[PDB]
Amino acid sequence: GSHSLRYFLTGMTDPGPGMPRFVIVGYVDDKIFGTYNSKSRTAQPIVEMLPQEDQEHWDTQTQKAQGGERDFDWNLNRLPERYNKSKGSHTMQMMFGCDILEDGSIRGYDQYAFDGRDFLAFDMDTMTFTAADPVAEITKRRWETEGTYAERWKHELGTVCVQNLRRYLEHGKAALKRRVQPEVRVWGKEADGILTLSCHAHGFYPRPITISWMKDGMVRDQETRWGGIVPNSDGTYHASAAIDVLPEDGDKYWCRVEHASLPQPGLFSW
Amino acid sequence: ALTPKVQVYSRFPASAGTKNVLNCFAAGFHPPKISITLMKDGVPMEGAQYSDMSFNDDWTFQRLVHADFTPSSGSTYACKVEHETLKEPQVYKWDPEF
Ligand SMILES: CCCCCCCCCCCCCC(=O)NCC(=O)O
Ligand SMILES: [Cl-]
């Protein structure tokens, strides 16, 4: 019963051809629910997840986003010189949100990164900042001495975020509760003396999945390598594991897949 | 590293002649500027869409590119990735498993 809302904010001085300088992606329980970017200058739900959003909500979101784009612009303009590294392209990132745990207690997250490196972080439950380095300390001391950010973001993390998570879980409940089984394909190919067995899980939701290989009823972690969990475009996920086998033992190897959509783990051969 | 880590996969278990989607996922890279091109027989595929820039919890950037396609048994499908950490574009071949 644990649920999460996360915003992932990027500001870029060199985004690339036809690409926005400032992007916000919002996730509920590993599903993108809304987006903002500097080219559209509007915050918009993923209608697949949120089919009936009111305009009022997304006006507010669009304006908070635009304010976030201004602040990133101000960071990207001051930070490089402060770090005596004004040469090059530059990035600014922020991750923030909240968790509603199964018992109803709350967790807030609020983290910043400059040029891909930890910069600053804020802890809602104590309302204290931490800086990643002496230059970030300048920002930390200015913000905590002014007093306003900690109130703001205590409120943002522990109230506003919590309310919106509760809202998105309800509005997107059709999409959030639909469990989506993995579609699994096992495949080998024999080069030189070895046979590569690959087990691929296609299109599952929710995102947590386990894949492992078996000879007899014994796993074989030592020769397995995992591709990791990667996204599809439709809010499902893809995962995979590979293992190399003597070509005269491939019928003895079984791919095991555990997923919330499967009452029992599923066993798949080549 | 900080170069792209690239995986190429189809949305569904692939089968010759059945409409599908080819995905190219590049992750772990910085800076965020990056070129990813889906290709059939070295011709760029049409209709490709690119995910909004996002990143991993370690701040490393990532991007999904996808495009409708109908895999052909006699075609090579690849993903070409250019990034300032690379001296020459790297191409990654789709393994159709069929
Ligand atoms: C999914 C699209 C909807 C986006 C939701 C809007 C939330 C954006 C939050 C503003 C980010 C503010 C940055 C910052 O740290 N400014 C400095 C400061 O607050 O003093
Ligand atoms: Cl079979």
Author numbering:
A (entry chain A): 1 to 270
B (entry chain B): 2 to 99
What did the authors write?
Here, using a mammalian recombinant expression system combined with mass spectrometry approaches, we identified N-myristoylated peptides as endogenous ligands for the chicken MHC-I-like protein YF1∗7.1. YF1∗7.1 exhibited the typical architecture of MHC-I and MHC-I-like molecules in which the heavy chain was composed of the α1-and α2-helices that formed the antigen binding groove and an α3-domain that was non-covalently associated with β2-microglobulin (β2m). As previously described in, the YF1∗7.1 antigen-binding cleft is composed of two distinct pockets that differed in size and shape and are termed A′- and F′-pockets analogous to the established nomenclature originally established for CD1 pockets. The overall pattern observed for bound acylglycines and glycine lipopeptides was that the acyl chain, which is similar in all molecules, and was inserted into the A′-pocket, where it could promote anchoring and is protected from exposure to the aqueous exterior solvent by the A′-roof, a structural modification seen in human CD1 but not MHC I proteins.
To further ascertain the ability of the chicken YF1∗7.1 to bind N-myristoyl-Gly ligands, the protein was recombinantly expressed in E. coli and refolded in vitro in the presence of the most abundant N-myristoyl-glycine (C14:0) (m/z 284.223) identified from the mass spectrometry analysis of the YF1∗7.1 elution and of a N-palmitoyl-glycine that contains a longer acyl chain (C16:0). Next, we determined the crystal structure of both binary complexes that also revealed unambiguous electron density for both C14:0-gly and C16:0-gly lipopeptides. The C14:0 and C16:0 acyl chains of both ligands were located within the A′-pocket in a very similar location to that of the endogenously bound mammalian N-myristoyl-glycine (C14:0) sharing similar contacts with YF1∗7.1. The glycine exhibited slightly different orientations within the binding groove. These structural analyses provide crucial insights into the binding mechanism of N-myristoyl glycine into the YF1∗7.1 binding groove.
